[PDB]
Every structure is written in C-alpha cells, then in structure tokens.
C-alpha cells in the first residue's frame, strides 16, 4: 500500500507543478484598468406570503413568470410573480423537503428531501388536478439537489457521495457518478447540458461527463465545506460558496483558481450563489441575513440587499435577467430589481 | 336646589306678588309708600314715616335654614321710600336674610396632565406598533384595541370637561337667568362617557382572559376566537349601558343626567365594572403563581418584583385596593384619598402601559437598531 | 384575470384549514445511538429514509420523527430540525466501559449545545439503561474511576432524591453520569434553551407523559418570555 | 367609576354656587 | 483499502494529462464575454420603469 | 488543499515517552479548533484531546488525564502531544484532526468513519 501512496503523492506534486507553470499573471492584473460598476441600489418590488415554515429551495420557470417554492410545512406552491397569485398548491407526502425543480417545458415539478425519494408531479393532467406520477427510489441518503434535463430525464445528488441519472420513462437508474468523499450539497447543469459539477463536504468540486460517467477534473482551494455552486453564463468557469466565508471562481480550461472574494468583516458562510445575465456580478446569500453583490472582475463589493429577517437559504435569477428572488428562513420571498 | 329650580321658584314668587299687589288694597294712610317689587321681595304699601317689615322670602336656597328674619326698608312721610346712605337706592336691610373646591382644583390639575401625557404616549406607541409589519400578531392586535379604548376614554373625559365648563360659564348662566342644560347633546355626551369607561374596563378584561388562555396550554381556532374577543370587548358594554339610558330617560331625566339620585338606577353601570376588576385580579394572581413556580424550578425576589410591577399596569390591578369601597360609604378624608388614588393612577396608567409595552420592549429596540443599520448601509 | 382570481381565493381558503392543523400539532425529533434502546420506546408508543409516529395525549397531537437509512455525518441534515418543539436525546448510561460510549454521547451533546442554529431548541435528555447500570455497578465490574478520575471524591448531591431501597453507590454513580451532562448544559446556556434530565428504562410507561409535560413547560416558558415576564 | 362620582360632586358644588350667585345678582 | 488506493492513483494519473491554456487567456476570455454582453443585464444598468414588469 | 502530516511515532517500552508532531498546511491554523483521535486495533475511532483557537482552553478524555499535554504552536502551524507514562493499551494509530468550520464552537463529525479533514496517522506501539 505504501507504493500507491507514494505514486499518488508524486502525481499530486506533478499536477501542482503544472498548475504553477500555466500561471503568468493574476486576473487582477488583466483587470487592472476596467470600468468600476459603481454602487448598486436594488430595492424590493414584491413579497409573497402563504408559506408557514422556512424555505429551502425555489426555482424559476423558463418563461420568467411562474416560479415554484418548497417549505417544510409540506407544501409546494406555484406563484405568478407578476400578479402574486397562487396557481397551484401541492400537499407533499413527506414534509421534510430540501429541494425543488421546475421542468424546462413547464409540465412537471420535482421535489425531494430526507425521505431519500424524488417525486415527479404532473401539472397539465386531463382533469387539471395535480397527481403524483412517478417515484424514483434507490438513493441511500437525503437528496440535496435535482435538475431536469428534459421531460424524461433528471439528475440528482444525495449526501451518500453520489450523483445519479434517472430515466423518468421506466424510473430505473441509468448512470452513477462516484468519486466524492463527502455529502454532495449541490450541482449545476451546463448551458449545453453535457457537463455538470458538484460541491461536496470535502472542499472539492468535480466536473463530470453526463454520457461516459467519468470525472474529468478536480478543483481545490477551499478550506471547508462547499454549500453552493453555479456555472458562468458562457460555460467556461464557475463559482462556489464555502463555510470559510469566501467565494472563489474556477476556470475549466486553465484548471486552477482565478479569484477570491474575501472581506475581514465577513466571518460567516455562504448559502447560495448565482451570476447575473451578463456574468459581471455575483450575488451570494450569507448566514448573517444579508446578500452581497461582488464585482466579479475586481472582487470589490458593489452593494448589499438588506431586508431579510432570517437566514437566506436560496437564491435565483430569471432567465432573462429581469428579477432576483431570494427565499429565506422567515418564510418570505422577495423579488428585487 | 337646582339653578333652574331656583329660577322657577323666584318666577312663581314674582307672579304671586304681581297678582297680589293688584288685589292689595291701599293702607288707608295718607302719603303712603306705594307697594313695589325690587326683584328680591314684595313690599306692601309702606306707612308714612315708618319702617316696613316683610317676612323673609321662602324661595331662597337658604330660606329653610333661616326662615326667620324680616327685610327692613324705610319709607319717608311724603310717601317716598327713604334713600339709602349716599346712594340713590332706597335704604334697605338684608343682612338678616343673608346666609351665614381647592381639593377639586388640585385633583383636576393633576389628572388632566396625567391623561394628556397618557394620550400623547399612546398615540405614538400605536403608530410605532402599526409601523413595522414584522410585529403583527394576535397579541399586538389585542394591544392595539386596548390603546384605542384608552384613547377614547381620555377624549370622552376631555369632552365632559368642556361641557361642564360651558354649562357654568358666565354667558350660559346669564342666559339661564333670563340653554344647554336641557339639550339632548348633553345627554349624548354623558352616555358616550359611560360607554367609553365601560369599554376600557372590558378590554382590560379581554387582555387578562387572552393571557390566561395562552398560559393554560390550550389551542383554539384563531379567527373565531379573535372575532369573539372583539365582540366581547366592543359589544358587551352596550347591553348594560342602553337600559341605564332608557331608565334615566323614562324616570329620572333632569339636569343632563349628571346627578344620580336613585342608587338602584346607578348600580347598573357599576356592577359589571367590579366583576371585570375581580376577574383581572384573579388572572393576575394565577399568572404570578406560574411565574413564581417557573423561577423556583430553574436574587429571585428582585426579578419577581420587577415582573409583578411590570404586570400591574397591563391588567390595572391597582384599582382593586379601593374597588369595593362603595360610594354610599365614602366620607371625610377617605373619599378624598380614594378619589386622589384612583384619578392619578388611572390617568397615568395609559402612559405606563404604552412605555412599558412599546418603547423599552426588546424587539422594538432591535427593530430600531437594525433599521438604523440598514439606513447606514447605503 | 377573473378566472385567476377565483382559484387564488379557493387555494387561499384551503391554506386556512391547513394552518389550523399545522399550528395544533407538535414536532419531536428522536435522536440517540443505535444501541440506546430508542427503537423499543418507539415500538412501545406505536430502505425508508425517515419514519413517522403520530400519537395523541390529552387530546393533543404529537408528531415524532425517527431518523433512518442516513450516514453518521450529521452536521448538515441536523439543521433541518431547528424549529421542532424539542429534541429527545436517548443516552446509553450503562454503556460505559468502541470503548467509551459515554464520552461519545457527551461530545455529541456538547456539539449540539453550541451550534448556532440550535441555540434556541430545547433538548430533552433520557438516560435509558438504568436497569443495566444497576447490575453493572453492583457486580463490581464498573470501576468508573479508571475512565473518570473525577469520580473518586464525588459525593451524592445534597438535594438527591433516591428511590426507596437503593444502594447508595448506584444512586451516586447514576447522579454522577447525569451531573456530567448537566455541567455541560449549564455553561453558556444564556436562558434561551434548556435541558430536562430524566432517568428512564426502556419500557417505562410514563415516557409519553414525561415528554408531554416537558413540551407543555417549553410552550409556557416561551409564552411568558414573549410577554417579558421572565 | 371614580371619573363618574367626582363629576356628580362638581355638578353639587356648582348648582349650590351658581344658585347663590343668581340670588345675589337678583338682590343687587 | 488497496483497491481504493489503486483507483485513486488511476484517477490522478488520468487527470494529470490534460491540456492547460495560459491563465491570462482565460482572464481575457472572461473579460471579453463580460464586455460583449454588457447591454443585456438590467440589474447592472437599470431600465426605465416602463419596461419593468415588476413596477 | 487541506493536508495534515504527522510524525514522531515509534516503539517504546511501557512507561515510555514520545512526542507526536502534526505538520499542518493548507489553511489558517489559528482560526480552527483541533483534536487528537486514535484508533486501536479491532476498535472504533476514539477521541483524546483538543485545544481552542488561541490555545487556552484544554480538555482530555477520561483515561489520559495528567499524562498527555496538548499544545499548539500557532506561529509554526503545528500541534503537539507530549506522551508520558504509557501503558500496554496505548498501542493505536493517532490521527491529527481538524475541526470542520472556523470561528465556531460546535465541532461536529471529527470522529466520523470517513471524516475528510483528518490526518494520515502514525502508529505508536508500546
């Protein structure tokens, strides 16, 4: 066994040397003389009420009008953000739900949690009444994230250190992704939906190929767990949030860390991240009840979205970049412009 | 004797004198003074060069006290009434018929200021409570109803003050000599007072009942319970207020209903108030017992005293000290002490409750601090 | 737009009824090591990632959740239970002498105590191996001194209330084990969450009553703290 | 209520005083 | 544990040989994308209240 | 990345003494709590000692009190354990452990079967 350890150490040293060799100048020097964005003064525009318990996940719709939010009172609610009406309200079987997804075509929604089951719901039923249409069983841990590929495929990540691909047609697991040593706390489909990442509790992010089912790279540099992740709009980088109270941006092609957003005042972890439409800002929700808009190309903070009375647990930006929704543990959703 | 009663008696005496002097024959004396009326008594014909003696009038308020005495007026021999000393008026003697509020002013000066400050604090407290939407809950709704009841009670007291001042102002008394003393608006004002006082007392009762239900570890439908509480608070007093008005209007309608003559027609608007105070005292006792048990299970007297003092103004238990000392048995300095105590404490209770449950409240200070921090984030 | 408004009224009208049931029920989390005997308690009151046990006491409905089919790294899925009425923590008191189970339970309880998301959630404490601790201490196999040097000068606290016909050593050791957790609890507690030690067996009938009374106390304390009485 | 007995006494006081003032005005 | 070590060594070896363009090129690409699509970000540069549907 | 390297292990007779140095790199040493965890043959993982961020507060397991003296040189980024008065049942691997999050007091999951920030370990035999 010692020889294998020595070989692994030598390979790690070689990778470190290559990463050092492929570095010539920091992104700051390249961005030495870019235009500062200036203070951002976004303000609330809406506020949705009706949830009883704290909110763990919200997802948008491809039309940037409807959205779905999940809480641990056992309810899935579909809001019409423009008019704030409630379109649907789904009473869940198990009240411990930790994620929700909205299908790209809008026909189905999915949600899972401590029950270790992903349930697919039908919204366009013949009678119109929403019914449980599928239950995907086979994960050995709580489900922490799920994402639709199309109306007949879904990718899920559970704390059992594995990500899976499901065939909604027969509900049989089609592929298994392995390699993490800690619970997988999130994932993110690529714009072309051929690659995705995952952030585990080992402080490492891995890049997968959806078809072959083999990991391609591994990015390190965080000090503690990673809670959230999201891909740059152009699909050649991404960002992550960690309990060490910092965010870092990795680039696939260069294969090493690019930037870090840290301030002395901030001593709390990040619970979510997301880029704007053009990928020049970086929203991120903190446990100190606030959000911060980071100047991605200079790392200098731009503004703050204060007004939440409790922890920020979820955060999403519409496809067209018109609105930002932020659920929170106070059971409210706020739309900001 | 009511002022209108005195005026009626004097008018009756004047009419009698006018009727009699036309029927009174001459005194059969040459150069006799002509019988005249000087707005105080009827003077028969006066004999020349002699004094005229007339029995003291009976309509005076003090006539019963001193029915004796005779008003004296001098008549000259020539039939002209003797002129008074260095004055045009005829000489007259009236000392024989002549009759032989600081604490109230002090009380007024005290509780008017007390009520003014209580109202001023309550309006601001209600504004702050309605400001932040975070604070919204059933507890705060009940508190807002209590604040409204207190404000209405203060306004009714002020209106009653104005009415009393107007009734006995110079102009009003001169007009009544020749008014508002019988207009319906006066009765409406007094009834509005009787109702505001009862509503305030019953909303204190509502505070107590809701707290007791919460601490009894019981759960009830929120909407139905809140509707029932609103009905109990603003609705029940009508039941025992309206019959009092009917009885006053049908049997004892006089002098703005201000003075209560028959205690039977007075206890109606007093019994329920005592009932509510007793219930609130019971609730106070039970809550203190529970707090004592909690403190004992987990310097104790310091915190217990702080809690009890903070609880006093909410349920208004201070009234229980003199609550059952009936009006019929309040004399000497006991009545003064009772009035002073109740007036001062009730006047300042509004301010006490407002400051205690709106300003020093920890969540309110936290809200202010975080609002300031958000203001300074920009 | 009219068709949209009417449904919202119907949907909202439904959430009112669901708001009554949610507010009229209590949630309880059931923790404890595998060999702590919790499953016996669950069966007494009575693949899947979680289990349900709904029972009613004094016409009050409770709702208890037993973890299952999950890994041992709790520091992520534990936060989901930050709003429960209280957490039950069954301990294996007699497991003393893995070699040191008691120390494991001690560290777990200490970690629960100091987590920020749990600095307001009450924790009930069960020491659920009394009838085995009795034999362990009596037979002379215990020798708790070796694994706890601090138990050589321990003297039964003065306020002790031993059960009738109890060997003083048994009560001394039992109270000592309770005293360790109560020493952890009463440091930096700050009067916002509490602990309710309760010696218990594995088939004790009064467990439902004990949990019911402790829940009642928790609700009453919270209510009184809202009015700033306490 | 104490806010209702004091008002009746004051209305006592004034009725006796107002009447005395009226009688004094009549005499003068 | 031998199988785990073997798998770890194999994965490290497989990941060792991957093309790595210069970092400055990645920075330039990100800058270019940010500048090119700068006019399709309402949050970065607000729009008149007429066009906002959340007014 | 997080990497903990130990040293100082070896073989010693009963009642001997050894020093276990823990060379740590890849994070800010002074922001995190620390622990010592050992795994004896045919047994689960164990917890021995700890020390706070600055290095004031200390705590020992039941049966090592008065023998081993945890100490951290925050300046040189290393954790110590001065072993003394060893016994036959001291034989076990010793892992230098790190605590999952900084600035916090709660220290979940250090003893887990697959903790991620745990050291490689050194075998101390008596």
mmCIF file of N, CA and C in Angstrom, chain B residues 205-280:
data_model
loop_
_atom_site.group_PDB
_atom_site.id
_atom_site.type_symbol
_atom_site.label_atom_id
_atom_site.label_comp_id
_atom_site.label_asym_id
_atom_site.label_seq_id
_atom_site.Cartn_x
_atom_site.Cartn_y
_atom_site.Cartn_z
ATOM 1 N N UNK B 205 -60.182 43.446 30.754
ATOM 2 C CA UNK B 205 -60.618 42.072 30.997
ATOM 3 C C UNK B 205 -60.232 41.156 29.840
ATOM 4 N N UNK B 206 -60.370 41.640 28.605
ATOM 5 C CA UNK B 206 -60.005 40.832 27.442
ATOM 6 C C UNK B 206 -58.512 40.522 27.453
ATOM 7 N N UNK B 207 -57.684 41.521 27.770
ATOM 8 C CA UNK B 207 -56.252 41.271 27.922
ATOM 9 C C UNK B 207 -56.021 40.103 28.868
ATOM 10 N N UNK B 208 -56.638 40.180 30.047
ATOM 11 C CA UNK B 208 -56.414 39.152 31.050
ATOM 12 C C UNK B 208 -56.856 37.779 30.582
ATOM 13 N N UNK B 209 -58.036 37.708 29.966
ATOM 14 C CA UNK B 209 -58.572 36.417 29.541
ATOM 15 C C UNK B 209 -57.685 35.796 28.472
ATOM 16 N N UNK B 210 -57.236 36.594 27.503
ATOM 17 C CA UNK B 210 -56.389 36.037 26.454
ATOM 18 C C UNK B 210 -55.080 35.514 27.029
ATOM 19 N N UNK B 211 -54.457 36.278 27.933
ATOM 20 C CA UNK B 211 -53.218 35.793 28.533
ATOM 21 C C UNK B 211 -53.455 34.494 29.292
ATOM 22 N N UNK B 212 -54.551 34.422 30.049
ATOM 23 C CA UNK B 212 -54.835 33.204 30.796
ATOM 24 C C UNK B 212 -55.013 32.018 29.861
ATOM 25 N N UNK B 213 -55.733 32.212 28.755
ATOM 26 C CA UNK B 213 -55.914 31.115 27.809
ATOM 27 C C UNK B 213 -54.578 30.658 27.242
ATOM 28 N N UNK B 214 -53.702 31.601 26.897
ATOM 29 C CA UNK B 214 -52.394 31.207 26.376
ATOM 30 C C UNK B 214 -51.611 30.395 27.399
ATOM 31 N N UNK B 215 -51.623 30.817 28.663
ATOM 32 C CA UNK B 215 -50.818 30.134 29.671
ATOM 33 C C UNK B 215 -51.463 28.860 30.202
ATOM 34 N N UNK B 216 -52.711 28.575 29.843
ATOM 35 C CA UNK B 216 -53.351 27.326 30.233
ATOM 36 C C UNK B 216 -53.015 26.179 29.292
ATOM 37 N N UNK B 217 -52.087 26.391 28.361
ATOM 38 C CA UNK B 217 -51.696 25.389 27.371
ATOM 39 C C UNK B 217 -52.927 24.793 26.688
ATOM 40 N N UNK B 218 -53.669 25.667 26.011
ATOM 41 C CA UNK B 218 -54.826 25.267 25.227
ATOM 42 C C UNK B 218 -54.765 25.973 23.881
ATOM 43 N N UNK B 219 -55.341 25.334 22.865
ATOM 44 C CA UNK B 219 -55.307 25.836 21.497
ATOM 45 C C UNK B 219 -56.732 25.918 20.968
ATOM 46 N N UNK B 220 -57.037 27.017 20.281
ATOM 47 C CA UNK B 220 -58.362 27.249 19.728
ATOM 48 C C UNK B 220 -58.224 27.892 18.355
ATOM 49 N N UNK B 221 -59.286 27.784 17.561
ATOM 50 C CA UNK B 221 -59.294 28.406 16.243
ATOM 51 C C UNK B 221 -59.045 29.902 16.372
ATOM 52 N N UNK B 222 -58.113 30.414 15.567
ATOM 53 C CA UNK B 222 -57.654 31.788 15.749
ATOM 54 C C UNK B 222 -58.703 32.795 15.288
ATOM 55 N N UNK B 223 -59.284 32.580 14.106
ATOM 56 C CA UNK B 223 -60.212 33.561 13.552
ATOM 57 C C UNK B 223 -61.466 33.678 14.410
ATOM 58 N N UNK B 224 -62.077 32.541 14.741
ATOM 59 C CA UNK B 224 -63.287 32.558 15.553
ATOM 60 C C UNK B 224 -63.016 33.166 16.920
ATOM 61 N N UNK B 225 -61.888 32.804 17.534
ATOM 62 C CA UNK B 225 -61.554 33.336 18.850
ATOM 63 C C UNK B 225 -61.360 34.844 18.787
ATOM 64 N N UNK B 226 -60.659 35.333 17.764
ATOM 65 C CA UNK B 226 -60.432 36.773 17.666
ATOM 66 C C UNK B 226 -61.736 37.524 17.438
ATOM 67 N N UNK B 227 -62.616 36.987 16.590
ATOM 68 C CA UNK B 227 -63.911 37.627 16.392
ATOM 69 C C UNK B 227 -64.701 37.663 17.693
ATOM 70 N N UNK B 228 -64.684 36.560 18.445
ATOM 71 C CA UNK B 228 -65.390 36.527 19.719
ATOM 72 C C UNK B 228 -64.810 37.543 20.695
ATOM 73 N N UNK B 229 -63.485 37.686 20.716
ATOM 74 C CA UNK B 229 -62.867 38.657 21.613
ATOM 75 C C UNK B 229 -63.252 40.079 21.234
ATOM 76 N N UNK B 230 -63.261 40.394 19.940
ATOM 77 C CA UNK B 230 -63.676 41.732 19.525
ATOM 78 C C UNK B 230 -65.115 41.989 19.949
ATOM 79 N N UNK B 231 -65.988 41.000 19.751
ATOM 80 C CA UNK B 231 -67.381 41.154 20.158
ATOM 81 C C UNK B 231 -67.496 41.371 21.661
ATOM 82 N N UNK B 232 -66.738 40.608 22.449
ATOM 83 C CA UNK B 232 -66.785 40.759 23.900
ATOM 84 C C UNK B 232 -66.310 42.146 24.306
ATOM 85 N N UNK B 233 -65.238 42.622 23.683
ATOM 86 C CA UNK B 233 -64.667 43.904 24.034
ATOM 87 C C UNK B 233 -65.566 45.074 23.701
ATOM 88 N N UNK B 234 -65.872 45.262 22.418
ATOM 89 C CA UNK B 234 -66.594 46.452 21.989
ATOM 90 C C UNK B 234 -68.108 46.302 22.042
ATOM 91 N N UNK B 235 -68.627 45.103 22.293
ATOM 92 C CA UNK B 235 -70.053 44.864 22.180
ATOM 93 C C UNK B 235 -70.793 44.699 23.490
ATOM 94 N N UNK B 236 -70.175 44.022 24.459
ATOM 95 C CA UNK B 236 -70.875 43.723 25.710
ATOM 96 C C UNK B 236 -71.334 44.981 26.432
ATOM 97 N N UNK B 237 -70.536 46.049 26.551
ATOM 98 C CA UNK B 237 -70.988 47.188 27.368
ATOM 99 C C UNK B 237 -72.326 47.764 26.939
ATOM 100 N N UNK B 238 -72.675 47.676 25.655
ATOM 101 C CA UNK B 238 -73.970 48.179 25.212
ATOM 102 C C UNK B 238 -75.103 47.541 26.004
ATOM 103 N N UNK B 239 -74.968 46.254 26.331
ATOM 104 C CA UNK B 239 -76.062 45.527 26.964
ATOM 105 C C UNK B 239 -76.475 46.174 28.279
ATOM 106 N N UNK B 240 -75.506 46.539 29.118
ATOM 107 C CA UNK B 240 -75.809 47.148 30.406
ATOM 108 C C UNK B 240 -75.699 48.666 30.387
ATOM 109 N N UNK B 241 -75.393 49.267 29.242
ATOM 110 C CA UNK B 241 -75.418 50.721 29.132
ATOM 111 C C UNK B 241 -76.764 51.215 28.613
ATOM 112 N N UNK B 242 -77.319 50.554 27.593
ATOM 113 C CA UNK B 242 -78.571 51.028 26.999
ATOM 114 C C UNK B 242 -79.716 51.026 28.005
ATOM 115 N N UNK B 243 -79.956 49.958 28.769
ATOM 116 C CA UNK B 243 -81.047 50.006 29.755
ATOM 117 C C UNK B 243 -80.898 51.133 30.757
ATOM 118 N N UNK B 244 -79.667 51.478 31.141
ATOM 119 C CA UNK B 244 -79.472 52.623 32.022
ATOM 120 C C UNK B 244 -79.975 53.902 31.371
ATOM 121 N N UNK B 245 -79.650 54.104 30.092
ATOM 122 C CA UNK B 245 -80.154 55.270 29.389
ATOM 123 C C UNK B 245 -81.666 55.282 29.306
ATOM 124 N N UNK B 246 -82.267 54.122 29.040
ATOM 125 C CA UNK B 246 -83.724 54.042 28.969
ATOM 126 C C UNK B 246 -84.338 54.429 30.307
ATOM 127 N N UNK B 247 -83.799 53.878 31.398
ATOM 128 C CA UNK B 247 -84.354 54.162 32.717
ATOM 129 C C UNK B 247 -84.213 55.642 33.043
ATOM 130 N N UNK B 248 -83.053 56.225 32.745
ATOM 131 C CA UNK B 248 -82.866 57.649 33.002
ATOM 132 C C UNK B 248 -83.843 58.487 32.190
ATOM 133 N N UNK B 249 -84.047 58.132 30.920
ATOM 134 C CA UNK B 249 -84.932 58.908 30.062
ATOM 135 C C UNK B 249 -86.397 58.755 30.442
ATOM 136 N N UNK B 250 -86.774 57.639 31.063
ATOM 137 C CA UNK B 250 -88.173 57.402 31.388
ATOM 138 C C UNK B 250 -88.542 57.752 32.822
ATOM 139 N N UNK B 251 -87.579 57.840 33.732
ATOM 140 C CA UNK B 251 -87.922 58.061 35.136
ATOM 141 C C UNK B 251 -87.179 59.223 35.777
ATOM 142 N N UNK B 252 -85.918 59.447 35.422
ATOM 143 C CA UNK B 252 -85.058 60.393 36.128
ATOM 144 C C UNK B 252 -84.329 61.300 35.146
ATOM 145 N N UNK B 253 -85.068 61.878 34.202
ATOM 146 C CA UNK B 253 -84.484 62.778 33.209
ATOM 147 C C UNK B 253 -84.534 64.199 33.752
ATOM 148 N N UNK B 254 -83.382 64.701 34.195
ATOM 149 C CA UNK B 254 -83.283 66.070 34.685
ATOM 150 C C UNK B 254 -81.824 66.460 34.883
ATOM 151 N N UNK B 255 -81.466 67.674 34.480
ATOM 152 C CA UNK B 255 -80.129 68.178 34.709
ATOM 153 C C UNK B 255 -79.034 67.372 34.043
ATOM 154 N N UNK B 256 -79.196 67.078 32.755
ATOM 155 C CA UNK B 256 -78.181 66.406 31.950
ATOM 156 C C UNK B 256 -77.878 64.995 32.435
ATOM 157 N N UNK B 257 -78.734 64.415 33.273
ATOM 158 C CA UNK B 257 -78.478 63.126 33.905
ATOM 159 C C UNK B 257 -77.230 63.150 34.776
ATOM 160 N N UNK B 258 -76.684 64.336 35.056
ATOM 161 C CA UNK B 258 -75.388 64.425 35.720
ATOM 162 C C UNK B 258 -75.435 63.823 37.117
ATOM 163 N N UNK B 259 -76.471 64.146 37.883
ATOM 164 C CA UNK B 259 -76.580 63.706 39.266
ATOM 165 C C UNK B 259 -77.449 62.458 39.337
ATOM 166 N N UNK B 260 -76.963 61.449 40.051
ATOM 167 C CA UNK B 260 -77.673 60.190 40.230
ATOM 168 C C UNK B 260 -78.369 60.208 41.584
ATOM 169 N N UNK B 261 -79.693 60.059 41.571
ATOM 170 C CA UNK B 261 -80.497 60.127 42.787
ATOM 171 C C UNK B 261 -80.791 58.742 43.353
ATOM 172 N N UNK B 262 -81.356 57.855 42.539
ATOM 173 C CA UNK B 262 -81.717 56.516 42.983
ATOM 174 C C UNK B 262 -80.556 55.564 42.712
ATOM 175 N N UNK B 263 -79.968 55.025 43.784
ATOM 176 C CA UNK B 263 -78.847 54.103 43.626
ATOM 177 C C UNK B 263 -79.242 52.869 42.828
ATOM 178 N N UNK B 264 -80.524 52.502 42.846
ATOM 179 C CA UNK B 264 -80.970 51.376 42.035
ATOM 180 C C UNK B 264 -80.700 51.634 40.558
ATOM 181 N N UNK B 265 -80.920 52.865 40.107
ATOM 182 C CA UNK B 265 -80.658 53.239 38.725
ATOM 183 C C UNK B 265 -79.197 53.591 38.478
ATOM 184 N N UNK B 266 -78.340 53.451 39.492
ATOM 185 C CA UNK B 266 -76.894 53.777 39.378
ATOM 186 C C UNK B 266 -76.066 52.496 39.374
ATOM 187 N N UNK B 267 -76.445 51.478 40.151
ATOM 188 C CA UNK B 267 -75.632 50.274 40.264
ATOM 189 C C UNK B 267 -75.541 49.504 38.952
ATOM 190 N N UNK B 268 -76.421 49.794 37.993
ATOM 191 C CA UNK B 268 -76.401 49.075 36.723
ATOM 192 C C UNK B 268 -75.072 49.288 36.014
ATOM 193 N N UNK B 269 -74.586 50.529 36.011
ATOM 194 C CA UNK B 269 -73.331 50.884 35.286
ATOM 195 C C UNK B 269 -72.143 50.766 36.243
ATOM 196 N N UNK B 270 -72.302 50.073 37.370
ATOM 197 C CA UNK B 270 -71.209 49.882 38.359
ATOM 198 C C UNK B 270 -70.922 48.393 38.574
ATOM 199 N N UNK B 271 -71.934 47.524 38.604
ATOM 200 C CA UNK B 271 -71.731 46.108 38.918
ATOM 201 C C UNK B 271 -70.812 45.411 37.923
ATOM 202 N N UNK B 272 -71.048 45.483 36.613
ATOM 203 C CA UNK B 272 -70.166 44.774 35.674
ATOM 204 C C UNK B 272 -68.716 45.213 35.759
ATOM 205 N N UNK B 273 -68.500 46.494 36.062
ATOM 206 C CA UNK B 273 -67.127 47.054 36.169
ATOM 207 C C UNK B 273 -66.427 46.330 37.315
ATOM 208 N N UNK B 274 -67.070 46.162 38.470
ATOM 209 C CA UNK B 274 -66.498 45.444 39.603
ATOM 210 C C UNK B 274 -66.244 43.987 39.246
ATOM 211 N N UNK B 275 -67.180 43.373 38.518
ATOM 212 C CA UNK B 275 -66.987 41.998 38.066
ATOM 213 C C UNK B 275 -65.697 41.864 37.256
ATOM 214 N N UNK B 276 -65.502 42.762 36.289
ATOM 215 C CA UNK B 276 -64.315 42.696 35.442
ATOM 216 C C UNK B 276 -63.039 42.900 36.250
ATOM 217 N N UNK B 277 -63.054 43.844 37.195
ATOM 218 C CA UNK B 277 -61.868 44.081 38.014
ATOM 219 C C UNK B 277 -61.529 42.848 38.839
ATOM 220 N N UNK B 278 -62.541 42.205 39.425
ATOM 221 C CA UNK B 278 -62.280 40.981 40.167
ATOM 222 C C UNK B 278 -61.665 39.900 39.298
ATOM 223 N N UNK B 279 -62.191 39.732 38.084
ATOM 224 C CA UNK B 279 -61.650 38.711 37.189
ATOM 225 C C UNK B 279 -60.189 39.010 36.860
ATOM 226 N N UNK B 280 -59.882 40.273 36.552
ATOM 227 C CA UNK B 280 -58.495 40.631 36.255
ATOM 228 C C UNK B 280 -57.585 40.383 37.448
#
